[PDB]
């Protein structure tokens, strides 16, 4: 992508989105990141949509294959999918470390990137057998939580989505169901008290998911 203009990469990422070509969309946004300028709010969202779709297809295949596994063929093909999944997560973590996080221009942007870092270590944790990977996920999420509580309102949709995901980490990955429940419940109650200030449609969608999970866990 090095010979194509930054503006052209961003335009083609939007075309690939409309066409449902998510592998191409991700390659175009990686090219744009490596140009070295800071991303706008619409550009961060393109980068997130592209990789989440690619890694989402790989996770749903790994789970079908793990379930079949319970002749070396099933184990071989499951390991193949697993290594491609790991390559995608390691490419994203490399972009965030080099140098999106360090160069971010404000709180809103730095929180978005640290949430992404926690999400991609968490996807690595799902297929590992590791304690170190879980410790890296927890630490990225905790740094994002600390900044967001000081710099953004309780209804901001990135603050809310960050709390939802850190809650799922506690319940599904780190075996702390008490911590997941308490976080989800405190998060929902504080956003509820702040609705009157909305902006209002964005927040209520993630609140609903917090409540759904509470019902399941409780």
């Amino acid at each position: 992508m090095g010979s194509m203009e930054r503006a052209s990469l961003i335009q083609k990422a939007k075309l690939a989105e409309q066409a449902e070509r998510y592998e191409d969309m991700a390659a175009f946004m990686k090219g744009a990141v490596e140009k070295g300028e800071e991303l706008s709010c619409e550009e961060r969202n393109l980068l997130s949509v592209a990789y989440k779709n690619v890694v989402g297809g790989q996770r749903a295949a790994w789970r079908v294959l793990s379930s079949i596994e319970q002749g070396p063929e099933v184990r071989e093909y499951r390991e193949k999918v697993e290594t491609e999944l790991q390559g995608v997560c390691d490419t994203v973590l490399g972009l965030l470390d080099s140098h999106l996080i360090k160069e971010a221009g404000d709180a809103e942007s730095r929180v978005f990137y640290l949430k992404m870092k926690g999400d991609y270590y968490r996807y690595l944790a799902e297929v590992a057998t590791k304690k170190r990977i879980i410790d890296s996920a927890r630490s990225a999420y905790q740094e994002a939580m600390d900044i967001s509580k000081k710099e953004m309102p309780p209804t901001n949709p990135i603050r809310l989505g960050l709390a939802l995901n850190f809650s799922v980490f506690h319940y599904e990955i780190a075996n702390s169901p008490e911590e997941a429940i308490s976080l989800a419940k405190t998060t929902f109650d504080e956003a509820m008290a702040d609705l009157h200030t909305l902006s209002y449609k964005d927040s209520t969608l993630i609140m609903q998911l917090l409540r759904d999970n509470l019902t399941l866990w409780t």
Binding site: N45, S48, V49, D119, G161, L164, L209, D212, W217
Partner: peptide
């Protein structure tokens, strides 16, 4: 499975 943030 619990639900995480959807891909807007």
């Amino acid at each position: 499975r619990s639900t995480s943030t959807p891909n807007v």
